[PDB]
Amino acid sequence: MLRREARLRREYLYRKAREEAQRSAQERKERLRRALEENRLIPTELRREALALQGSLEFDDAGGEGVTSHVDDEYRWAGVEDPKVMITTSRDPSSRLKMFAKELKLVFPGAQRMNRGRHEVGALVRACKANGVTDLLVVHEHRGTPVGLIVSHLPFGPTAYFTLCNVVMRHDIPDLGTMSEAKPHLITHGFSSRLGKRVSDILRYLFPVPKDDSHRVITFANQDDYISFRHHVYKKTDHRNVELTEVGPRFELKLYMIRLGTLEQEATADVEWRWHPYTNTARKRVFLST
Amino acid sequence: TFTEHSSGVTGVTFTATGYVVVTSSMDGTVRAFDLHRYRNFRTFTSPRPTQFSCVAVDASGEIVSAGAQDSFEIFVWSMQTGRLLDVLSGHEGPISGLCFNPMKSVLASASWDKTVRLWDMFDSWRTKETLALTSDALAVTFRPDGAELAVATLNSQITFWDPENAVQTGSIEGRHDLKTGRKELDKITAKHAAKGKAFTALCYSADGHSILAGGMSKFVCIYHVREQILMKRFEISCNLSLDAMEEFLNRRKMTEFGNLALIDQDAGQEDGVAIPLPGVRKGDMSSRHFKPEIRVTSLRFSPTGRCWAATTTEGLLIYSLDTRVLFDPFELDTSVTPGRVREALRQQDFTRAILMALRLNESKLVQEALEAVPRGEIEVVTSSLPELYVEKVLEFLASSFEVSRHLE
Amino acid sequence: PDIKLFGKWSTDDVQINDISLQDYIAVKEKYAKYLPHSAGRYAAKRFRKAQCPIVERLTNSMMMHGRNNGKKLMTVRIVKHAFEIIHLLTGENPLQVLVNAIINSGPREDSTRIGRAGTVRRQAVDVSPLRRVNQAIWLLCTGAREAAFRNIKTIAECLADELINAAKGSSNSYAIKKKDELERVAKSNR
Amino acid sequence: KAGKVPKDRRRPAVIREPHERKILALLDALSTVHSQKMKKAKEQRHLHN
Amino acid sequence: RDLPERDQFRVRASAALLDKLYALGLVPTRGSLELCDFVTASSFCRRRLPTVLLKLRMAQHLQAAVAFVEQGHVRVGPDVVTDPAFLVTRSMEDFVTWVDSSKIKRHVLEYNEERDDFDLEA
Amino acid sequence: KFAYRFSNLLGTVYRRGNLNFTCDGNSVISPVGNRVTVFDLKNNKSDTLPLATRYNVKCVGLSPDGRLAIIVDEGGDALLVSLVCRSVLHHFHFKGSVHSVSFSPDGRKFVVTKGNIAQMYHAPGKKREFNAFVLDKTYFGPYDETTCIDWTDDSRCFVVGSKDMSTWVFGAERWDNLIYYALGGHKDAIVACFFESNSLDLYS
Amino acid sequence: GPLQSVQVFGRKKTATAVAHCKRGNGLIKVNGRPLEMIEPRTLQYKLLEPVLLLGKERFAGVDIRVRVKGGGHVAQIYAIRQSISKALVAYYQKYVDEASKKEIKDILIQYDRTLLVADPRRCESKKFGGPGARARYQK
Amino acid sequence: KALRKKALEKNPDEFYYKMTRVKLQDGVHIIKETKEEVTPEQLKLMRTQDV
Amino acid sequence: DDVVRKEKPKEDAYEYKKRLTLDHESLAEIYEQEYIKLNQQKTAEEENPEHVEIQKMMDSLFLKLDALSNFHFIPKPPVPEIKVVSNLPAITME
Amino acid sequence: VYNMQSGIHRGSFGKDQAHKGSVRGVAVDGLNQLTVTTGSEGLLKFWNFKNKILIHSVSLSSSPNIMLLHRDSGILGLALDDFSISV
RNA sequence: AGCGUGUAACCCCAUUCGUAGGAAUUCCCAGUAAGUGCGGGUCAUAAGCUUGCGUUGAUUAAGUCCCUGCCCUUUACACACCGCCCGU
RNA sequence: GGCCCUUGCGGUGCUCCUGGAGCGCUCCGGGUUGCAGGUGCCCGAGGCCGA
Ligand SMILES: [Mg+2]
Ligand SMILES: [Mg+2]
Ligand SMILES: [Mg+2]
Ligand SMILES: [Mg+2]
């Protein structure tokens, strides 16, 4: 299995390097196709090798997979299969950290929470890959309050690092009751840039395909690179009037790092995007919106 | 004959109660067939395109299980529902084989990561057990009572474990016993090849006191499990028109430039029908088809216990119990002789004659003794008969119903 | 060869007088070990801890009681000293004394519980042999721990006295009092 | 490195007469100056090119 | 290719053809039928066992790689392969390794200071 | 304890050789690789004979009475077997490969065709000797390998087909009017050749 | 002629022991010290299990030296036991008949399999599996 | 980082003919100096030259 | 803005029956229409010689390719279809 | 008892000697469980093969001459000096 | 013992001395609970704090819907089994 | 264990029966050999490479 995992990683990295080249080759092909369909000059760049691209156009069909995408390779089983989520904490967790980790299990459908004892980080990832765990969550705390969250996609998927700002848990609020636990509807708002689309994809694939009649809503709203997490259930008292009751934890997210590899590959994986706070114009710049 | 499967059949089995047969194929399908209506009523396939290598069914028959070449995971389906109950993961490498406990309804699966894993189906907390091995595992079988497990390993060792306690009861070394011969095209010798070959087929007897093993040889080895010795070696075939039958190839066929097997190869391939293709191990298009190598592909023993069968390259071989093979008396004495038997028959002392004829294990003497007794004295003889001889009389009666005119 | 616990206590002469508990006390030839420290995994499966030797079970159950957990060698030495003191005081095999104490300390019937906010009602029910062994070991360890607390007497002597009293059947031991009260409550609640 | 040698295996070092040490030291001093001159001239060729 | 592009027969046949070629390793990616035209006789040769041994760095020389399989030192799973003409699948490529109780495996373990007489010779 | 004996060979009904019916015609004799099986169509039964050989069976010849049979492998080893008792009576080794073996209808002689020649032997007798068959005569007609044998009903003459595109008819006894005769008229190998009910009239 | 010697490995957690067994008179040493001088002595019988199972007669013809490194006290002790047992079995296989090796190996396996086969502990928990039984979960 | 990435795809079954005559020391590949292989007759000549 | 279910090429025997009942709307009539359509789809295949010719040459190549891989390929999912069985004794199937 | 592979002595039957007189014949059963020996004195002894402990002793009417064992059936044949054969 | 290249405690053997946190409430199933030491400060967070790594290592439980709740349903004809949820 | 012109030591040169794969030879016998239709086969170099 270890040899198979290494082989699949080299296949994934090889395809990622050549992704840009195929896109440019594809783009040149469409420009030639328009020139053929509407009688016009072949572009001077496309004047040479025009016959070869014309030969390719005959060979293109719906059967082929098309141009590859590194995002699609990472989230291959996003729609077909339900995700499997595992939640763990840092070593020797606090009392309130264990309480926060208990609530995150309730939020994610099908999630499981396991005790972190003397487990090496690399050993944890090996067990998750063997048993088909899709996504792994690690949460950090400071003085009894959650402060950091790491989301890792197990099959050599991207690893995202977050910092929590304003955490309010259900356990602090008295007499709430029990949660709905239905498959939730997802609301994504405020993500307009390319990076914002990248981040929202990671958060959305943590959840399974819901039902049409589900009354459970989870909202991710972006405002000045700060992502607000909200959980709600709605009741239609009458037409056009709907009531909202807040349930579940409430906290804020701020992304600062995305790495290509898994969290066991800190010393080897490349950084897709990093936040640079010492840049001369870092104060007046945002990255999650345009 | 059923022809629904398009590609090769990897494994077959029978359900414990009904006349239902379950089959797995390289099509990616496991199909179930009934002998009452002769139809393929149920078909199981994986959500992901995978090909299956073996099949196992529960004694209850509600559970169907299969293993894969590549996805390295066990797929378990419900018989009555027809939907995929679960996928078992944790093994690394292809799965050697699967088998259900006859009495406990737990699954044992061998893998090439030197592990045999036990899976509990009807367990609320999903208990799983791991048995580590020193070498690669190839086969797993349960004793009919279900209290013992056997694993064949790549170092040619058969290890017997206790499943519930996860303790290794015993071990048997069998590399020397699996005598292997050199193929005509092999550059290496028989010993060097044998150093890398192990048993590939195991089978318990009905009583469980002996085990049968087979592989890349013309020999099937029967071992006594408790004494860990080879009781007997059977020669499946003596045909010398099959490759690798003899350890030492004939010095007569050598010339200066070797044995020149390719010329005889092409003479064999003059059969036509298809075209040989380089690198195909088996089939019509295989290069080595006219003289296939000798192999015991599978072994099985009858639940009845009077015969056993083996699938080999020659065909399907059946071996049955025969009295002529061995003389096995139970409790002999100088008084025990057929003359005294017929004497006691003449004085109408039926019980003593029948008992002393049963101390002998010649079937004709007990046949004459039982047929000499007139009706109405049957109950007296049955009451006088002790407990130990009851099983002997039942076995003789069961043998008798087949070939006796006097049924009732 | 012959296997003796700590090199001096034989296991062949040890015999069990209760038929029900023969399958749940592991002291015989297959389960004979030199030391009560094997680093095995007996909690992995249900009913597997019945295959653990009873000396190792006593060592494990004596670690949770009144100590910083994880100190197993100290508990092994405590058990060794207790066995030596038992042999000095009584003059017979300490393994037989332990087996008799576990046999005597095990309750035969308990009371299952039906409890509401106002009052609780009762019902006498039977006890499985595994729970009998577990509860006997727990009662013996608890009695030894409570005897050793706030007294000028090390835990080894209190443990030795507890096993001696329980195997004798005397009422001076904590486990016998607990067993008698539990069976009395179950008897009154039939 | 393998600097260690047994006592019986090792051989005494050569003892030089003062005459050839004067010759040998002269050549090394001349070699040091010549090597420096060529390396310095290489950078001047590298810079101008 | 000559068939109409919007034809169900062409689409199903094209997907069926490329997945077989990709499985054997003859085609780099399961892209369009353009990649299906790049297969040559040399493409089949690159999938043979001796040259795959070369890529896995088990052997450095092609005549050495052919020697190893002919002398029974390489196995694909439990089975040992002697025929150099043996196209290995991508899935089967993960499980080509030295046969146990072989001198070459002893040399590898001796270099790595992991030579165990109990496990190897047994 | 473990007393087992081979019973039957399932899974194979024909590998190579010539098919034959028994004398009464109810059962069929089929070579299955190394062994020989009798299929009783009368009683719906299959029985593999206990005998085994070193090589695959090429030729099977049946005596007219139905008691005896000759089974020859590819290597040239021959076994004389009794069908009544299902036991191999005797062993023999023909020097070269035999294309076919045929018994005369009278049952006193049989012909073995090998190489470019045909050898005529006497039928086995009641007397037991170290050598199974006594060779009587030899015929050396054709250019190339002989293929098939047929006998006249009167057992006075026999005919042999050959690879040399010609058929040779010989006499069981030296007849003044007929010692041997050759027939051509074909442009390929002879496969079979037959005789009439009560004549020397023949087909090629 | 040439010396008859075998080197074997034993492992327990991060503790690794290398054992060398050659022809000799019965000397067994660990890090230059005798077996009885290894600490802690509470598990000293744990260090003496193989010899007591096999007797001084079988160890009378070999000299064994063990070099152990890493881990804690208990892991080191278990590694030394495993190394001694495996080294003795390997020597009796290579330079003595197979029957004595078979019987000694069977005795060692029958007492405790960890004397010859090391089983490292992995992460297996209910949390990996889904709720409910394998069968009867979601129909 | 370049060195650590190369360790990921390292094949433990890799074989080289240099591996036969060289053994690792703590994981580091030290090339031991070649021997001289002197003979007793040669050894006696060196000692006479020294004196 | 949720995760959208992708399209499966595999069709199970529980959604195949669902598809037929939805469009048509007793069980035999539903099967009767599908059987007629399946035969009509089968027939059109044979009247097109180009599809016929290319289907046979594809079969030859795939048979050759499977042997070279020693029958280690990605399997094709079984298509659900309707078969016609007659009311006559079971001896004939032997 | 000697080992065939190494030639090493593996023990002996009896405290000092198996029989008073000459040993006429020895045999080992198929399962390597029981060993039977004969002596010129006329005693027939059965020995356990592994631990070499005497099981049973049978007196013979005459001195044994030759002895062979049929392992599969478990049948022992004795020829005596009085020309009789005992089974 | 095990992580950590920018000019060990714990434990162990022996010597001496000598009679702790209510009511409520939270969390936890195997290298887990608990104890002990040793490092780093890694473009966010973190200073009486944060995160790694190793050492020792347990008691009970592997099953029900009784309480407190949650997710679904009450329209692939092998054998065998089974034979209509209700109301506005 | 045995060895007594020896050796924990080493080397050579001839002989040692082809399954199909040296057939055909007791006697007898060997003399007068007494234009259907065929269209085959071969022709691809691109490296998820090692050094
Ligand atoms: Mg803790
Ligand atoms: Mg800890
Ligand atoms: Mg407290
Ligand atoms: Mg700490």
CATH number of the domain residue C31 falls in: 1.10.455.10
Instruction: Round the CA-based radius of gyration of chain C to a whole number and report it.
Output: 17
Which of B82, B107, B69, B86 has the alpha carbon at shortest distance from B32?
Answer: B82
Question: Do residues A121 and A138 touch, judged by C-beta distance below 8 A?
Answer: no
Task: Tell me how far apart the alpha carbons of residues B140 and B153 are, in angstroms, rounded to a whole number.
Answer: 10
Nearest CA to G49 among G18, G23, G78, G21?
Answer: G78
- Distance, CA of B119 to CA of B127 (rounded, Å): 7
Question: Which residues sit opposite F10 in a β-bridge?
Answer: B316
Q: At what angle do helices G98-111 and G73-95 cross, to 10 degrees?
A: 160
- Strand ranges (DSSP E) for chain C? 109-115, 120-126
Is-contact B268 B218, C-beta < 8 A? no
Beta-ladder partners of B386: none
Longest distance between any two alpha carbons in chain B, whole Å: 84
Helix (H, G, I), strand (E, B) or coil at B151: strand
Longest dimension (CA), chain J: 41
Long-range CB pairs of A14-17 (<8 Å, 24+ gap) are: A15/A68, A15/A70, A15/A73, A15/E29, A16/A70, A16/A73
User: How many whole angstroms separate alpha carbon E68 and alpha carbon E66?
Assistant: 6
Name the nearest CA neighbour of A205 among A73, A81, A68, A69: A81
Residue pair A159/A151 in contact (Cβ under 8 Å)? The answer is: yes
Q: In what order do the strands lie in the sheet with B84-88?
A: B52-57, B63-68, B74-78, B84-88
Q: How far is the CA of F80 from the C1' of L31 (A)?
A: 38
Interface test with C, best of B125, B128, B130, B165 (most C CBs within 10 A): B165
Contact between residue B47 and residue B37 where contact means Cβ atoms under 8 Å apart: no
Going B240 to B242 to B243 to B244, the CA torsion angle's sign is: negative
Q: Give SS3 for C33.
A: coil
C72, G46 Cβ separation under 8 angstroms? no
Cα angle C59, C62, C64; round to 5: 120
Residue B272 CA: distances (Å) to CA of A152, B268, B285:
59, 9, 10
- Taking the C-alpha atoms of residue A214 and residue A208, their distance in angstroms, rounded to an integer, is 13
The B 236-275 residues near strand L by Cβ under 7 Å are 240-241, 250, 252-253, 264
Residue B104 near residue B122 (C-beta atoms within 8 A): no
Task: Determine the distance separating the centroid of ligand 3 and the alpha carbon of C68, expressed in angstroms.
Answer: 14
Cβ pair B68, B52 in contact under 8 A: yes
> How many whole angstroms separate alpha carbon F126 and alpha carbon F132?
11
What is the spatial distance between Cα B74 and Cα B24, in angstroms, rounded to a whole number? 13
Q: How does B308-335 read in b/e, with b if 16+ C-beta sit within 10 Å?
A: bbbbbbbbebbbebeeeeeeeeeeeeee
Domain range for G14 is: 4-139
Residues B28, B45: Cα–Cα separation, whole Å: 6
Please give the Cα distance from G91 to G22 (Å, whole number).
8
Rounded to 5°, angle at Cα I65 from I64 and I69: 120
AA letter at B331? E
Question: Is the CB of residue A74 less than 8 Å from the CB of residue A155?
Answer: yes
Dist. CA B63–CA B74, nearest whole Å: 13
Closest to F128 in 3D by CA, of F102, F162, F90: F90
H runs (alpha helix) in chain A: 2-17, 19-37, 50-59, 70-74, 95-107, 121-130, 194-204
Query: Among chain F residues 134 through 173, which have CB within 7 angstroms of nucleic chain L?
Result: 135-141, 170
- Rounded distance between C-alpha atoms, residue I25 and residue D16, angstroms: 116
For strand L, give the nucleotides within 7 A of a protein CB: 8, 18-21, 23-31, 33-34, 36, 38, 44-51
Contacts of H22 in chain E (CB under 8 A): 111
Q: DSSP letters along C139-157, please?
A: HHHHHHHHHHTTSSS-HHH
Ligand nearest to the Cα of A94, by number: 1
* Structure method: cryo-EM
Question: In terms of C-beta density within 10 A (0-12 exposed, 13-18 middle, 19 or more buried), how is residue A222 classed?
Answer: buried
Q: Look at the block and give the residue holding tokens 């690789």.
A: F33
Domain count, chain G: 1
**How many Cβ atoms sit within 10 Å of the Cβ of residue C188?**
10
What 8-state DSSP symbol labels residue F173? S
Burial string for F4-26 (b: 16+ CB within 10 Å, else e) reads bebbbbbebeebebeeeeeeeee
Using CA atoms of C168, C174, C177, C181 in order, give the dihedral in degrees to the nearest 10: -140
| Interatomic CA distance for residues I7 and I10, integer angstroms | 9
Q: Please indicate if any CB of chain I lies within 8 Å of the CB of E19.
A: yes
d(CA E60, CA E54): 6
Q: How many CB atoms lie within 10 A of CB E3?
A: 15
CA distance F48 to B316: 12
Q: Do chains E and B touch (3 or more CB pairs under 8 A)?
A: yes
Peptide bond into F124 cis (omega under 30): no
Q: Which nucleotide is nearest to F138 (CA to C1')?
A: L24
* Residue A113 φ/ψ, nearest 5 degrees: -115, 130
Crossing angle of helices B388-403 and B350-359, in 10° steps, is 90
Do the beta carbons of residue G80 and residue G66 sit within 8 Å?
yes
- Quote the CA–CA distance of E98 and A147 in Å, as a whole number: 50
Q: How many residues does this entry show for chain C?
A: 190
Assess contact for G82 and G115: CB atoms under 8 A: yes
C-alpha triplet C109, C114, C118: angle, nearest 5°: 135
Burial of C25-56, coded b for 16+ CB within 10 Å and e otherwise, reads bbbeeebbbbbbbeeeeeeebeebbbbbbbbb
C-beta of residue E103 within 8 angstroms of C-beta of residue E79: no
Q: How far is the CA of C181 from the C1' of K68 (A)?
A: 34
Query: Rounded to whole angstroms, how far apart are CA atoms E63 and E67?
Result: 6
The residues near B153 (Cβ < 8 Å, ≥ 6 apart) are B133, B134, B135, B136, B137, B138, B159, B198
Angle between helices C155-168 and C72-90 (to 10 degrees): 50
- From chain E, the residues in CB contact with A59 under 8 A are 1, 32-34, 37
CB atoms E3 and I73 under 8 Å: no
Q: Which strands form F35-40's sheet, in the order they lie side by side?
A: F20-21, F27-32, F35-40, F45-48
Residue A223's identity, in one-letter code, is Q
Q: Which residues contact B326 (CB under 8 A, 6 or more apart)?
A: F1, F3, J72, J73
* Alpha helices, H only, chain F: none
Closest by alpha carbon to B93, among B126, B128, B67? B67
Non-local CB neighbours of I75 within 8 Å, separated by 6+ positions? B7, B26, B27, B28, B29, B49, B50, B51
Closest chain E residue to the Cα of H9, Cα to Cα: E56
CATH number of G32's domain: 3.30.230.10
The CA–CA distances, whole Å, from A56 to A19, A60, G48 equal: 18, 6, 77
CA distances from F190 to F160, F187, J73 (A): 9, 9, 58
**The J34-39 sheet, strands edge to edge:** J23-28, J34-39, J43-48, J54-59
Give the three-state DSSP class for B260: coil
Name the resolution in angstroms.
Answer: 3.6
Checking F173-180 for CB contacts under 8 A at 24+ apart, the result is F180/F139, F180/F141
Nearest to B204, CA basis, from B144, B137, B118: B144
Q: What share of chain D is helix, strand, coil (3-state, %, to 5)?
A: 65, 0, 35
Which of G106, E107, G111 minimizes the C-alpha distance to B157?
Answer: G106
Q: In the numeric block, which tokens belong to residue A191?
A: 């993500």
Are B92 and A131 in contact (CB < 8 Å)?
no
F30 neighbors F18 (Cβ within 8 angstroms): no
Discontinuities in chain D (C→N > 2.5 Å), after residue: none
**Are the C-beta atoms of residues A188 and A204 closer than 8 Å to each other?**
yes
Q: Give the DSSP H/E element, type plus range, for residue G109.
A: helix G98-111
CB neighbours of J16 closer than 8 A, spacing ≥ 6? none
A117 CA to K37 C1', in Å? Answer: 17
**Pair A160, A150: CB distance under 8 Å:** yes
Residues 6+ apart with CB under 8 A from J36: J26, J27, J29, J44, J45, J46, J47, J67, J69, J76
Close Cβ partners of B186 (under 8 Å, ≥ 6 residues apart): B193, E82
Rounded-to-integer distance, Cα F180 and Cα B143, Å: 72
CB-CB contact of E115 with E106 (8 Å): yes
d(CA C29, CA C15): 11
Cα separation, B52 vs B67, whole angstroms: 6
CB C186 within 8 A of CB C108: no
Q: Which range marks the domain in which residue C41 is found?
A: 5-188
Phi, psi of J2, deg, nearest 5:
-130, 150
d(CA F64, CA F82): 13
Q: Identify whether the C-beta of residue F170 lies closer than 8 Å to the C-beta of residue F148.
A: no
What is the token pair recorded at H23? 């053994």
Other Cβ atoms within 10 Å of A16 Cβ, number: 16
DSSP string, B329-381: -SS--TT-SHHHHHHHHHTT-HHHHHHHHHHS--HHHHHHHHHHSPTTSHHHH
Residues F79/F61, Cβ–Cβ less than 8 Å: no
Is the Cβ–Cβ distance between C107 and C132 less than 8 Å? Answer: yes
Quick check: helix, strand or coil at residue G34? strand
| Nearest alpha-carbon partner for A128 in A180, A184, A98, A88 | A88
Domain count, chain C: 1
Please say whether the beta carbons of C175 and C166 come within 8 A.
yes
User: Under an 8 A CB cutoff, do G9 and E121 touch?
Assistant: no
Exposed/middle/buried for residue A34 (C-beta within 10 Å: 0-12, 13-18, 19+): exposed
User: Is the Cβ–Cβ distance between A125 and A263 less than 8 Å?
Assistant: yes
Strand J43-48 to J54-59 pairing: antiparallel
Query: What is the CB neighbour count within 10 angstroms for residue B11?
Result: 19
| Rounded Cα–Cα distance for residues B346 and B369 (Å) | 11
| Chains E and A touch, contact meaning at least 3 pairs of CB atoms under 8 angstroms apart | yes
Contact B134, B114 (CB under 8 A): yes
Q: Which residue's C-alpha is at the least distance from the C1' of L49?
A: E55
Q: What distance, in Å, lies between the first and last C-alpha atoms of chain J?
A: 26
Residue tagged 């028109």 (tokens) = B241
Tokens 């239609």 -> residue: A236
- Report CA torsion sign: J52, J56, J59, J65: negative
Task: Tell me how far apart the alpha carbons of residues G31 and G39 are, in angstroms, rounded to a whole number.
Answer: 12
Listed residue (F94, F113, F109, F98) closest to F161, CA to CA: F113
Two tokens at B300?
């099985």
Q: Which two tokens stand for residue H19?
A: 């591996």
What CA dihedral angle connects C119, C125, C131 and C135, to 10 degrees?
Answer: 50
The whole-angstrom separation of Cα A216 and Cα A234 is 7
Distance A117 CA to ligand 2 centre (A): 6
* C5: amino acid identity, one letter: L
In the three-class reduction of DSSP (H, G, I as helix; E, B as strand; rest coil), residue I76 is classed as: coil
Chain centroid to Cα J32, Å, comes to 13
Q: Cβ-count burial of B336 within 10 angstroms (0-12 exposed, 13-18 middle, 19+ buried)?
A: middle
Helix (H) or strand (E) holding E66: helix E62-70
Within an 8 Å CB–CB cutoff, is residue A43 touching chain B?
Answer: no
Distance CA B32, CA F185 (A): 61
Phi, psi of B161 (to 5 degrees): -120, 155
